[PDB]
């Protein structure tokens, strides 16, 4: 899915000029591009970025003639983004004083695409355009540009310094030409490819989410010996983790190779007599007993599993399986085997039959002939479009515990007063995180935490960027917008006030 994408920049005077209440359109272009390149560089993807300017005092580009394609400079060709380019954008670039034609600059970008992507591979192409539209431009070529964009599969996004909703007549005319060309490529969906820089900052202020391609696990689901169904499974929920670790280096040279780890062996007894690795053997505890056991014997005697399985032990009521028992560190969704009409019919039948009877299936799972087998539940899930089983691991008898906690309800000391219960009843309403009666008698969630990105990665990447751009300064504090996104809505915060005073006044609390 490689995308070749070109940032195309008006470097004239009109976007260089600033309304004093706001940073210049040049500055906003700098910021939004800065967020973009930060995202791409801290992303694992290998997509490459090229940056071109139009309106430059100079004139240098692949198409450029003596008079044609004037005031256009290819500031950056297509390579992987890096901190050098980042600093170039941060400080090197300066406002210009000339004007050029953006529909020349995008065919300069076509030439860049043609000549720089032919040695490479790309599923998609995108051009990103920044300007105020204050300059006279021609439309003579509009057919052959739209044809070029169609035939080479080039997508467009136009970024306007103002909300879509004081613009000059040229400005509004250009707006409508932007409508007409983006209609000519993409219709009404085309008309939605316009964004204000304010909402752009709101949208890409955050560092990008992590993702992976879960490997499909093909298998035969078995009922008894004779009934079998072909299936495929995917990991769906996991405790996701950054793969790049810290590396340890010499404080003076910053090299890795200057340091070495050594493992000592010595007897447990006094004066710590040193031992050669050769005369060490492997053994195990068994209560007060210690049993010697070689790794070869341990491997040869270890339990051997048959290999891949997904076999059903039987069915029970869903109410047998309280979800507090759910074990394991993964969640699988199981679909039918790829492109098997009969298999899809079969698994549809199973999900249907199970959901109708309000029952669940108990299954035995084994990833491969090396892994340890597991016992787990599977249960039906139904949506628009697809149906699937969900699967989760269940406990073995050896991994439960029990604790005999004192019953609070029958206690004479800790029974609350009716007045206390009324203050609690006020409080639990005030802290409600959901809105009822949306005319569909449905809950709206005011704090849907499944959509919030993990803040540990946000903090890590922010600190890394700060150190890279500024080695001398210490680490910056956490970001206020991060805090705001981690706190609940201010309406709930304000409504909490009086019930909290009431409950503090009612309940006596004191420390040991």
């Amino acid at each position: 899915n490689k995308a070749a994408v070109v940032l195309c920049m008006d470097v004239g005077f009109t976007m260089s000029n600033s309304i004093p209440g706001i940073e210049s359109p040049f500055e906003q272009a700098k910021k939004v591009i800065t967020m973009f390149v930060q995202r791409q560089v801290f992303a694992e993807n290998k997509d490459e970025i090229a940056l071109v300017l139009f309106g430059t005092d100079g004139t240098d580009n692949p198409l450029s003639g003596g008079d044609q394609y004037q005031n256009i400079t290819v500031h950056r060709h297509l390579m992987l983004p890096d901190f050098d380019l980042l600093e170039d954008i941060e400080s090197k670039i300066q406002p210009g004083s000339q004007q050029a034609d953006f529909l020349d600059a995008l065919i300069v970008s076509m030439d860049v695409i043609q000549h720089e992507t032919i040695g490479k591979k790309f599923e998609k192409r995108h051009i990103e355009i920044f300007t105020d539209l204050s300059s006279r431009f021609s439309k003579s070529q509009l057919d052959i540009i739209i044809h070029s964009l169609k035939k080479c599969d080039i997508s467009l996004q136009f970024f306007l310094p103002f909300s879509l909703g004081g613009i000059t007549e040229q400005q509004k005319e250009g707006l409508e030409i932007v409508k007409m060309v983006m209609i000519s490529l993409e219709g009404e969906d085309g008309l939605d490819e316009i964004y204000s820089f304010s909402e752009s900052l709101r949208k890409l202020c955050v560092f990008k989410k992590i993702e992976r391609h879960s490997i499909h696990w093909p298998c035969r689901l078995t009922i008894g010996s004779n009934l079998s169904i072909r299936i495929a499974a995917y990991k769906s929920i996991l405790q996701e983790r950054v793969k790049k670790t810290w590396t340890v280096v010499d404080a003076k040279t910053l090299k890795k190779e200057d340091i070495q780890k050594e493992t000592v062996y010595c007897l447990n007894d006094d004066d710590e007599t040193e031992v050669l690795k050769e005369d060490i053997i492997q053994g195990f505890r068994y209560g007060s007993d210690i049993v010697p056991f070689s790794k070869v014997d341990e491997e040869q005697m270890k339990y051997k599993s048959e290999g891949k399985c997904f076999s059903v032990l039987g069915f029970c009521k869903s109410s047998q399986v309280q979800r507090r028992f759910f074990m394991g560190n993964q969640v699988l969704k199981v679909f039918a085997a790829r492109d098997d009409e009969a298999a899809a019919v079969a698994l549809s039948s199973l999900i249907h039959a199970l959901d109708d009877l309000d029952m669940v299936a108990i299954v035995r799972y084994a990833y491969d002939k090396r892994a340890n087998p597991q016992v787990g539940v599977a249960f039906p899930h139904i949506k628009h479009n697809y149906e699937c089983l969900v699967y989760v691991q269940l406990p073995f008898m050896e991994d439960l515990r029990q604790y005999m906690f004192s019953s609070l309800k029958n206690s004479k000391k800790y029974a609350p007063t009716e007045a206390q219960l009324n203050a609690v009843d006020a409080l639990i309403d005030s802290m409600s995180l959901a809105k009822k009666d949306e005319k569909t008698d449905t809950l709206e969630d005011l704090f849907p935490t499944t959509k919030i990105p993990n803040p540990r990665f946000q903090r890590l990447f922010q600190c890394l960027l700060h150190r890279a751009l500024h080695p001398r300064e210490p680490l910056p504090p956490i970001q206020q917008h991060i805090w705001n996104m981690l706190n609940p809505p201010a309406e709930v915060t304000t409504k909490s006030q009086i019930p909290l005073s009431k409950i503090k006044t009612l309940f006596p609390l004191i420390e040991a």
Binding site: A3, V5, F36, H126, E128, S155, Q157, D189, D192, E193, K203, L204, H384, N385
Partner: peptide, 13 residues
Amino acid sequence: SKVKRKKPRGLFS
């Protein structure tokens, strides 16, 4: 309504 137009594009994804 089962598939939603909100999905980000290009620069946004």
